[PDB]
Amino acid sequence: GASPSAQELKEQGNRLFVGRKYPEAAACYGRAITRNPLVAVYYTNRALCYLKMQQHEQALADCRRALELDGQSVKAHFFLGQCQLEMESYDEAIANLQRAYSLAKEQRLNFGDDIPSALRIAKKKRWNSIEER
């Protein structure tokens, strides 16, 4: 009988995630959330688990909750944008990826070419969507 802290469950979820045990990692992050539900990173951790499993509605809800808790979160806007892109909500996806870019610059955070690459892909898939449909 030990009940772990939220941070311990987060670390446990990280190890499960690296092992590609995403349902188990998601459940770990969920148990961290119940212990401290005001911590936005636990929600973006779980949202990435759901994205790996193509659970878009759950990933969307976690990203939106992370933004309620931290409206300036680069990660929440980025994974929200990715989720929306996979759901083909192209204009919302691009707008959230642009917000992630602007916030990362404001916050002095280096993500290499991650955000420009996501933006370029999102725009190209949007245009391809239209050039066909």
Ligand X SMILES: *CC(=O)Nc1ccc(NC(=O)C*)cc1
Fill in the DSSP letter of residue 5: P
Check residue 130 for interaction with ligand X (CB under 6 A).
no
How far is the C-alpha of 62 from the C-alpha of 52, rounded, in Å?
A: 14
Task: Determine the 3-state secondary structure of 133 from DSSP.
Answer: coil
Nearer to ligand X, 33 or 49 (CB): 49
**Among the listed residues 1, 2, 18, 113, the single contact to ligand X using CB under 6 A:** 18
Cβ atoms of residues 40 and 73 within 8 Å: yes
Q: How far is the CB of 131 from ligand X (least distance, A)?
A: 29
Check residue 89 for interaction with ligand X (CB under 6 A).
no
Check residue 17 for interaction with ligand X (CB under 6 A).
yes
